[PDB]
Nucleic acid binder design. Sequence first.
RNA 1: GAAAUUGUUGAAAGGGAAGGGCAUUUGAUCAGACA
RNA 2: GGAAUACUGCCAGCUGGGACUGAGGACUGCGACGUAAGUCAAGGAUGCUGGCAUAAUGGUUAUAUGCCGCCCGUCUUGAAA
RNA 3: AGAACUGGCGAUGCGGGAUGAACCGAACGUAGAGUUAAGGUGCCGGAAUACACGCUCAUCAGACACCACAAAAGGUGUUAG
RNA 4: GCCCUGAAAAUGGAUGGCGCUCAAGCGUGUUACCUAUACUCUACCGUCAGGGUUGAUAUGAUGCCCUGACGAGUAGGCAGGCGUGGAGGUCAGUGACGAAGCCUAGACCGUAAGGUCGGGUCGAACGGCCUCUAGUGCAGAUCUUGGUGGUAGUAGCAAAUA
RNA 5: CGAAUUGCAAUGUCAUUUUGCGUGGGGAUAAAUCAUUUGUAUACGACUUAGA
Lengths: 61, 106, 127, 197, 175
Amino acid sequence: GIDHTSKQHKRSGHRTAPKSDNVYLKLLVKLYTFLARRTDAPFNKVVLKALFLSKINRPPV
Amino acid sequence: AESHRLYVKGKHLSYQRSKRVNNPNVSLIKIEGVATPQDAQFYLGKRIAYVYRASKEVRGSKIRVMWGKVTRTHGNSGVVRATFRNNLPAKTFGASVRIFLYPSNI
Amino acid sequence: MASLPHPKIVKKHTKKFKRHHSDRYHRVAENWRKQKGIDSVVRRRFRGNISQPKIGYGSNKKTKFLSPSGHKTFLVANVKDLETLTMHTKTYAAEIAHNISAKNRVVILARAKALGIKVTNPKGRLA
Amino acid sequence: SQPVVVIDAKDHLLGRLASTIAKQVLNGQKIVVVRAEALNISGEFFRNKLKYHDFLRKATAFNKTRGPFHFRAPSRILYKAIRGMVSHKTARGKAALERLKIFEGIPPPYDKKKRVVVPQALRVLRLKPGRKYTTLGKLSTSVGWKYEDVVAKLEDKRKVRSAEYYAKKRAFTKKVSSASAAASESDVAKQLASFGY
Amino acid sequence: SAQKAPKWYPSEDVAALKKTRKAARPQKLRASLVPGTVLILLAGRFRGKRVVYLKHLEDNTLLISGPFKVNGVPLRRVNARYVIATSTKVSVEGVNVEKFNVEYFAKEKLTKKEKKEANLFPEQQNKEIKAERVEDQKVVDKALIAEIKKTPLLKQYLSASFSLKNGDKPHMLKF
RNA sequence: GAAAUUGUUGAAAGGGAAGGGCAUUUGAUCAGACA
RNA sequence: GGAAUACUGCCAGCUGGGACUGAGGACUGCGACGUAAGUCAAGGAUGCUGGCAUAAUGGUUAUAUGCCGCCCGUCUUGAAA
RNA sequence: AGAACUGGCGAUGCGGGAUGAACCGAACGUAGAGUUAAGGUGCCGGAAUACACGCUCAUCAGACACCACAAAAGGUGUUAG
RNA sequence: GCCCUGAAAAUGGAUGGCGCUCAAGCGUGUUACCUAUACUCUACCGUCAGGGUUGAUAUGAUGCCCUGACGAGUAGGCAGGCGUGGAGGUCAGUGACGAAGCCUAGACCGUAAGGUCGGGUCGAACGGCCUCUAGUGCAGAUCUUGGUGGUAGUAGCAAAUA
RNA sequence: CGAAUUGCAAUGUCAUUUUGCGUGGGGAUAAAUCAUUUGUAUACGACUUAGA
């Protein structure tokens, strides 16, 4: 067997889609996934990873 | 005159096994005249048959044959392992199987 | 109908996975229930004892839900349900429901013989 | 290789026979063992006697008809040794131990049938010369056998009835060798001698 | 509505194979299989028979003819594993066999698919024998018999049949 | 009109327990036509 | 004084037999052989032949056999107890 | 009975130690082929009644650590020194 | 060094058993051989991670595809799911030409919870799907109620004169 | 003298006990148990005896 350094089968503690069911947020996710995949920019990625956020980590400005 | 055989009579000794547990997927065959793994290597690949008499007459006849083949050698005294299409029934540990010469190297 | 698109169906552990001590007590059915005990011999996975279910036994994704012919089953109740499998024919096969009237078995089968659909239970209430 | 085997047990060692028998009979060969009163065993007589008197000691206390049946005949001592070497409690050991037929002396059926010898158990080959060995007839008699003086009265008749056969056969074949030696000076034999016959 | 459909019913029109890269090349035989050498069959109708090897056909097989006069076989083809190749040879340079090939022996039986219901001798080309094979079998053995009748005890050896005796240990004896 | 429990019939086995797991023979049954 | 052989090691040296596996499923790539076309054992098996259309073969089920298999739930350091 | 460092049992099956909660090996998806561990190859028991130098013959021999026990003192029994 | 005396315990008994004596014992050495759920290679499942794809195909990117590693587990946590009684929508759902239920060492699917089919029986209502909601799933509690067994055609029906 | 065309391998059929059916050539013509009975016996069965 294998002597383990790491906890096995460990999820990354980030979220990769919104827990919401707002279809008009699913769409912007569909959009920024595309613009983060087929682009060399990090602004898109930041926005993507920000759309997933909860209401306390996504506060009013 | 009498003699018509093209085969080599051997015995089904047992199954492959450890102590206290067994593998019926593999059987051990004792060939008559064979005494070492060198001079058993002639017999690898050869075919093996276990004939038995049944009751029903199916596709013609009352006897039925279970076919298989030799795979390799067992340890230091002329025993070989054999594998069959359908493993042997364990009522035969002491049964005369017949090894042919069918795939030959001569 | 002919169905020549599927590869060598194989089934890991084609037994039935009976409960423990269903063979001894009658109340204890054969529907599987996991032994949560502490001094057990199945939760502990001894030798000579029965085999608990796992995901290792899971069937291949290309040969799941496929009947040995290679079709997979669709439960039908009328002709409207068949007429969806007009096109998905070499993959799907129809199973007429158990609550269907004999008057309505034959019309379904008469439509299936036309559309080339393959039914799994055509000898149900032949009358 | 032969369908049935007939083992003369003179000058043999018991536990070194029985490991050959108990495997040859488990692999499917029928064996009979004959002249078992002439068996041999390691160790001095008093010692191998005490190793039986410490067996007779072992009997089921609450009823001794349930317990270790101490057999006094050589044919049954050997069978004990073999039954121990065999899983007699299954249908494989059972089936094997019915392939065996052990006797004291040589009865008629196996009288006129050839006998053999297991060389990896002969006391001669195995044991050191100078060691003491014990004979099973003397032993069985000392632990309660009864039929020693019978076997000697029968096996002697066997022997004098056999020696005459041997002399008959020898005084027949001495002329077969002469009339086939008188016929070995032709091409039929000068040609076979090149093939190796 | 006794069962819900899958969400889109994926269609599965069959697609093609990948371009394989496995090819055929000529077979490589043993050292012993020299034309003219005696063989010993091991299976079939004529098992036990000693015969003579002639031609490596192109269906991956071996042509033989035990002389029909002797041992009772015609020209036929054999799988080369189900034989033994003895160490006795003959001069075969007197015969001609190039007429023989993988279609000389080929049957064209019209009873190709109906062996399962027509089973009581339907009389569809299954008995006859013709003068087109006997002439080849005659011209070939009339030339081969001669080299047999050079040597002694070969007309008699091919006439015999191979059989294993009791003290025969095939892993030790030299054919 | 369930089950425990019970009778009759039929099949089968059965040396101081029975039942179970792997593997196969034999028997019973089902399979599928690939017409 | 002149060799061999052994022992240990190396070969991107040749060669023979046997066993298990054949996953993937258009093309695209790395390479090799070839004047070129193209061919190849090079990003996972093809060909030829025969047998069967049902006791072929497979599943279930019963029994026989070889090996293994202590009665569950619980408290417990520890339960077949 | 009570502390220290570590490893384990608990919560853990598997091959071995006959059997054993803890020892040796080694940690578990379902399967197939190959190779090994610890332990073993007279038979039960799969595997050499193998090879080699010796010691021992016991009228309670002796034979897989944990482990299931054995001493002081003696013996011209024998072997070597 | 080996062996022996020293060495005595109570049901019959344990190098595991048989048995072993130039060992099948002891010490030591050398090769071969046996075999685990361990190691190596391949297939399959699942989880985790990293990637490619809104070219645009069934507008789906919830999926599809490529690669690699991994898998023990009580108490316990979380996730995805099977199932039951009733509710709102829906299949213009099944049904007296037989619903539901019940029996079925008859069949299929699913790792599995479980679902589906055929046969027999029977006689009036019942389901799939998206969702809502709970008095929602039992082998156990000296559990509750009801019912039935083995022991068992057994103990035993023998004071009071007949 | 025939032996091909089991078409390139598919035990390729013989082994030996047990049972029955009939065919035809013979051969021999009974005891035990229950019930009854005795008591050298006995919980019941059993044992021992007698009965044309």
